[PDB]
Design a protein around this ligand. Structure first.
Ligand code: ZN
Ligand code: ZN
Ligand code: ZN
Ligand code: ZN
Ligand code: ZN
Ligand code: ZN
Ligand code: ZN
Lengths: 573, 320, 304, 67
């Protein structure tokens, strides 16, 4: 069949349209400042014609779309931004190739179309709302349709049916007309939430459409029944401008974006979440795409807005499915393991979650240890008994030995002062900061001025965090209270003071007392027992009532009403 | 004596509590405007509230609008602002004193905004901006400018500025005294909506809903149809700022617009501090009083759209 | 030990699984542009409690935040964005959206608690950005602070979890691009309290094959640092500061295992920083431990 | 919108929404003599085995002043 490789060429002006003929050797590039014809020979692009020779920079040549007929290799048709439709007749003796200049539209024209077989038909859609159907031999004149929606965006002739064409409107509707009855459409339905930019028919099916819109979506519709049904739905990452079906593969598409995104994607509608391929050669937004031949599914031509034109080979794309990470892994706190992996490596579109149930000594040592209150010897014996009863023998021997060294000529004043430090560092290096911190707290002042100030802080902070993970606030606060470093000791002192006011006079209350300064009334009245509360006071933030800590607690487990009787359901249950 | 010094009090009775009553004569537009204002100034977002009110103060002081500046400084004091900041621009931090260059260009000469300004704003350093933080500020500045223009245009009564501005004598210069912006290469509906939606979604939705309320607003006493002279005024005000449409024939502008209206539009848009009562009364002598408000609303929308399109094109050129 | 299965009900592949700070919640993200949150009951069974569409492209990673700031999650996607979610009294709402990237965002990570509320993100264009929330009472005001620029495409990042006042903040970033040349794939950046900027500190020359994940180790007691890398094999490094610009380190190598005879995809330490878990293409999880003679053995082979 | 006072045991800011929706264990609680507060459940659990104010450098027997 055909042969070629990836190649590109640089143009003179940006292009925003493209079209191919039934030779697969020629291509048309149109834009605001360019109208050329190129040749795809075997290794490069060669530029034959330049249909702007005779440069009168009229606004009749600012093309927005261009089509090439597929019956006669000589007809062409462009759509301008003035409202003019020009038909060119390449096989003409003169240098200019203009033939006709229909000027029946008032506003901008967006799309043009040709009939696949009958080589005298045109279809044009404009921004006014109407769409016209010229006849390129001046017989029977024009025939006008009205959509009554908005500016129209696209127009396409059906491949199997002979007399049917489709339209796409800016409000989000899709209609379906027959050209022998320009009086009422044969269907209408809402497709997208917003403008619909593109549509396409299936080369092989009989009722399959494909619409793309500004809401970043590509839908496929079935029209063999009486009502339109939606089968598939592809969710891209930007707005969609063009949609083309791949030849000979009835589940493939090709899309390009209208903003932000410069790539070209090929989707498979049975896997809408991940693209099957992506070409990322351009450096600006792509404007037009086209498959070369209706029977070779390996060639794609694109024209972008960086003055470039390229041909792509499907066997050279960047497949992103086989460039990803197939599994995830995490380690828990209680020793659990979470592992999810693909269903092709474990036992190609699903995964398999599984938790493996792979530190009781930590939580049992934390609660049973004694730190302050008694002198050294009994604390050491208590800790040794605990450690021995848990099964850790070396720790118990360390606790016992630490009593003989302190709690007891002679040996020199501090003969062991250089070994307790090594023991503490030995225990802290393995990750057991519990032992080091406990020993530091118990000993107190005999080992204090030996360890650097930035190491005690590290050891205390790590221990506090590990304790807070397991939700043991009593031990954490006990450590904070007896900490040897000021920075740790100042942790539960910042912003833990409450300000309370008397609700009769709305005045602040003094720091120590239960009688108001102006009202001369006691305000810490218990709402259950009707006594004076000098200690702990519970409070409800909804109705501003409360009392003793253990009175309200017992009242609220038998009723669901504020005991002061204000019609409040204090727990909202 | 009542709401507006130009519209008679009896007319307002028959047809910031003053602007809200003069703008209420077209109900379907007031709701959308209030929704956008509430989103832009009260709902939580990428910028702090006090910074937002300071941005509003800076933007309203370009056109020398006392009403808005007073209201916004009153609001700024009560949200937790620094009273020291109200002595001048030179007391604010070096992250708000960067928007002061884009301020002039958006207010006076939109066509000079390029990608280098965006690069200067987003360049790495010790006090930088993010994309969301800056796209909010741009919309806020445009909103305040247009509001000032409308407030001066309708002549609203109440119930310093030179310290909040750099280069006080810039002003407006005519366009023809630079390439033309073709309104088919970069359109709001196809190009700007998508970008503003990706970078700031709710604001984009609200702006698109507000743009469609100033289009479906009929004219009662025309004498072609309402859709024609509306197009004429819209295209004229866009052409003032440097945007030309390809499909529109520009001859009909004179045949559809009286020469008296053509000066009121330019005065209220380009130099809104010089509008006066005689100007208000010269044009459309024998017409209802609720149309010279519709003209102002159209003008406000057009100015907003022009400035936003220029800024968005700059950002898109930067990011490509 | 014992393995129990979970019904995920995801329409495509799962790319990340994350635990929380108290160990009783879990989050999963998939390529169907969705995020799910699971809870554990008294009977010991996991059941879903929320699921909502999060992005417009494939979601790669999802991470938790410290419970001091609330219940917060962060995500990254193929649509070049990062989002912050919070749970209010029970559905999850969106708080912010970071849109400075020009290409796909690959990983997201929360900073250790003692620096505040910071977030770091990495892209496929080679740029790493660090954000901050100066006021914790509004979770919708983030501000860009620093911006590093590597020479290759990033794939993973990791913070140093040490909490000492003698260690300066550092972050390690790895690449994944396959090139015919031979360039270093792992770099380490360090913070300078004097100049107030992140500066290059070291470069792991020996690593040349593409990297897929890296992870520091939980310090808890030590004076040096441990780093784990998941290339074609499993590698473990050690960085010890030298006595006193960027601090000078002495980089060594302490372990290398080709026991997977495949490509290694993920690595994960444990809460104490003593056991390393790795996953590979074969489909098995392996556990590594070190004795008192500094040799790294194997401890178990878990198979799904 | 500024932080409310924080609990003395879990070091997490206090608050209550305004099935159960505000249970008893999350209510405010404070001594009326030294004005140091915390969660109801946290303080109830603390004052079982100890008797002194959880905040450092305090002296109240905050539960013995009533019983
Ligand atoms: Zn009182
Ligand atoms: Zn009582
Ligand atoms: Zn009550
Ligand atoms: Zn109550
Ligand atoms: Zn007390
Ligand atoms: Zn106290
Ligand atoms: Zn608490």
């Amino acid at each position: 069949v055909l042969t070629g490789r990836t190649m590109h060429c640089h143009l003179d002006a940006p292009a925003n349209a493209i079209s191919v003929c039934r030779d697969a050797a020629q291509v048309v590039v149109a834009g605001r400042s360019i109208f050329k014809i190129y040749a795809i020979e075997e290794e490069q692009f060669v530029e034959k014609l330049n249909l702007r020779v005779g440069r009168k920079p009229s606004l009749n040549l600012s093309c927005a779309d261009v089509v090439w007929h597929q019956m006669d290799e000589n007809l062409l048709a462009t759509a301008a931004t003035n409202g003019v439709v020009v038909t060119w007749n390449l096989g003409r003796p003169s240098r200019n190739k203009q033939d006709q200049l229909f000027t029946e539209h008032k506003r901008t024209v967006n799309k043009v179309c040709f009939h696949p077989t009958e080589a005298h038909v045109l279809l044009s859609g404009s921004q006014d709302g109407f769409m016209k159907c010229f006849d390129l031999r001046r017989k029977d004149s024009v025939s006008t349709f009205s959509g009554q929606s908005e500016s129209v965006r696209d127009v396409q002739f059906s491949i199997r049916d002979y007399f049917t064409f489709a339209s796409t409107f800016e409000n989000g509707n899709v209609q379906l007309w027959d050209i022998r009855r320009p009086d009422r459409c044969e269907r209408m339905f809402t497709a997208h939430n917003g403008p619909v930019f593109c549509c396409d028919w299936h080369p092989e099916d009989r009722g399959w459409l494909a619409t793309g819109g500004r809401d970043k979506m590509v839908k496929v519709w079935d029209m063999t029944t009486h009502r339109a049904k939606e089968m598939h739905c592809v969710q891209t990452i930007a707005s969609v401008a063009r949609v083309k079906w791949r030849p000979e593969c009835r589940h493939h598409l090709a899309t390009c974006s209208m903003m932000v995104d410069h790539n070209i994607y090929v989707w498979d509608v049975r896997r809408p979440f991940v693209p099957a391929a992506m070409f990322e050669e351009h450096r600006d937004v792509t404007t037009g795409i086209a498959w070369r031949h209706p029977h070779d599914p390996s060639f794609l031509l694109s024209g972008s807005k960086d003055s470039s034109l390229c041909q792509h080979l499907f066997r050279d794309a960047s497949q992103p499915v086989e460039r990803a990470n197939p599994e995830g892994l995490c380690y828990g706190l209680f020793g659990d393991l979470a592992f999810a992996a693909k269903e092709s490596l474990v036992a190609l579109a699903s995964s398999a979650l599984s938790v493996f149930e792979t530190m009781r000594w930590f939580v049992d040592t934390a609660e049973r240890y004694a730190l302050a209150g008694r002198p050294l010897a009994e604390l050491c014996d208590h800790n040794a008994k605990v450690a021995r009863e848990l099964g850790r023998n070396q720790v118990a021997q360390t606790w016992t030995m630490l009593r003989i060294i302190y709690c007891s000529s002679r040996l020199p004043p501090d003969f062991f002062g250089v070994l307790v430090r090594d023991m503490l560092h030995f225990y802290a290096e393995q990750g057991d900061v519990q032992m080091a911190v406990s020993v530091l707290i118990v000993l107190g002042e005999r080992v204090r001025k030996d360890i650097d100030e930035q190491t005690q802080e590290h050891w205390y902070t790590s221990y506090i965090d590990l304790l807070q993970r397991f939700r043991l606030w009593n031990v954490s606060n006990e450590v904070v209270k007896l900490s040897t470093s000021r920075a740790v000791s100042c942790l539960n002192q910042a912003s833990t003071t409450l300000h309370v006011n008397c609700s009769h006079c709305k005045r602040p209350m003094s720091s120590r007392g239960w009688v108001c300064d102006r009202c001369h009334r006691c305000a810490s009245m218990c709402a259950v027992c009707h006594h004076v509360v000098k200690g702990l006071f519970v409070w409800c933030q909804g109705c501003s009532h409360g009392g003793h800590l253990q009175h309200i607690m017992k009242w609220l487990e038998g009723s669901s009403h504020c005991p002061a009787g204000c019609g409040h359901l204090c727990e909202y249950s | 004596r009542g709401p507006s010094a130009f519209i008679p009090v009896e007319e307002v009775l028959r047809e910031v509590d003053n602007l809200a009553v003069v703008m209420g004569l077209h109900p379907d537009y007031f709701t959308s405007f209030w929704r956008l204002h509430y989103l832009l100034l009260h709902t939580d977002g990428p910028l702090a509230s006090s910074w937002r009110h300071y941005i509003a103060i800076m933007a309203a002081a370009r056109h020398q609008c006392s009403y808005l500046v007073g209201s916004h400084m009153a609001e700024f004091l009560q949200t937790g602002g620094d009273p020291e900041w109200l002595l001048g621009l030179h007391r604010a931090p070096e992250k708000l004193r960067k928007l002061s260059e884009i301020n002039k260009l958006l207010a006076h000469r939109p066509w000079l905004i390029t990608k280098e300004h965006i690069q200067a704003l987003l360049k790495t350093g010790e006090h930088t901006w993010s994309l969301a933080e800056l796209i909010q500020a741009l919309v806020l500045l445009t909103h305040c400018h247009s509001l000032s223009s409308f407030v001066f245009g309708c002549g609203i009564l109440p119930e310093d500025m030179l310290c909040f501005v750099e280069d006080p004598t810039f002003g407006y210069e005519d366009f023809t005294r630079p390439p033309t912006f073709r309104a088919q290469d970069y359109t709001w509906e196809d190009h700007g909506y998508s970008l503003i939606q990706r970078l700031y979604p709710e604001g984009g939705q609200l702006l698109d809903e507000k743009f469609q309320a100033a289009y479906s607003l009929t004219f009662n006493t025309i004498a072609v149809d309402t859709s024609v002279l509306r197009r004429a005024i819209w295209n004229y005000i866009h052409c003032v700022f440097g945007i030309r449409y390809d499909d529109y024939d520009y001859g009909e502008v004179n045949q559809l617009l009286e020469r008296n209206l053509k000066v009121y539009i330019k005065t209220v848009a380009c130099y809104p501090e010089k509008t006066t009562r005689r100007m208000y009364n010269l044009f459309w002598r024998h017409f209802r009083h609720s149309e010279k408000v519709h003209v102002n609303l159209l003008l406000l929308e057009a100015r907003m759209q022009a400035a936003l399109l220029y800024a968005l094109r700059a950002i898109t050129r930067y990011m490509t | 030990f014992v393995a129990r299965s979970i019904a995920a009900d995801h329409k495509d592949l799962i790319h990340d699984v994350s635990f929380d700070f108290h160990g009783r919640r879990m989050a999963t993200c998939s390529s169907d542009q969705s995020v799910k949150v699971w809870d554990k009951s008294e009977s010991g069974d996991w059941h879903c409690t929320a699921s909502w569409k999060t992005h417009s492209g494939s979601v790669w990673r999802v991470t938790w935040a410290h419970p001091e700031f609330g219940q917060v999650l962060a995500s990254c996607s193929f649509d070049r964005t990062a989002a912050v979610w919070e749970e209010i009294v029970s559905h999850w709402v969106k708080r912010t959206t970071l849109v400075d990237s020009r290409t796909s965002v690959t990983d997201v990570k929360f900073a250790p608690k003692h620096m505040g509320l910071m977030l770091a993100t990495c892209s496929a264009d080679g740029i790493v950005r660090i954000y901050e929330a100066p006021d914790v009472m509004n979770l919708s005001q983030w501000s860009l602070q620093h911006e590093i620029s590597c020479k290759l495409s990033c794939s993973c990042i990791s913070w140093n979890p040490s909490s000492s006042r003698a260690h300066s903040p550092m972050i390690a970033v790895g690449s994944d691009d396959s090139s015919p040349n031979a360039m270093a794939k792992v770099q380490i950046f360090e913070y300078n309290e004097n100049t107030r900027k992140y500066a290059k500190a070291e470069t792991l020359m020996t690593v040349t094959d593409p990297v897929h994940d890296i992870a520091f180790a939980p310090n808890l007691g030590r004076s040096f640092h441990i780093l784990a890398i998941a290339t074609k094999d499993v590698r473990i490094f050690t960085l010890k500061p030298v006595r006193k610009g960027p601090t000078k380190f002495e980089i060594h190598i302490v372990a290398q295992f080709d026991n997977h005879n495949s490509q290694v995809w993920r690595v994960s330490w444990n809460i104490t920083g003593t056991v390393l878990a790795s996953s590979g293409d074969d489909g098995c999880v392996r556990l590594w431990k070190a004795n008192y003679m500094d040799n790294w053995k194997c401890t178990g082979i878990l198979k799904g | 919108r500024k932080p409310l006072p924080r609990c003395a045991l879990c070091l997490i800011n206090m608050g209550t929404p305004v099935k159960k929706l505000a249970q008893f264990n999350n209510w405010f609680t404070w001594c009326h003599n030294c004005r140091h507060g915390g969660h109801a459940g946290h303080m109830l659990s603390w004052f079982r085995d100890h008797a002194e104010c959880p905040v450092s450098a305090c002296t109240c027997k905050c539960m013995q002043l009533d019983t």
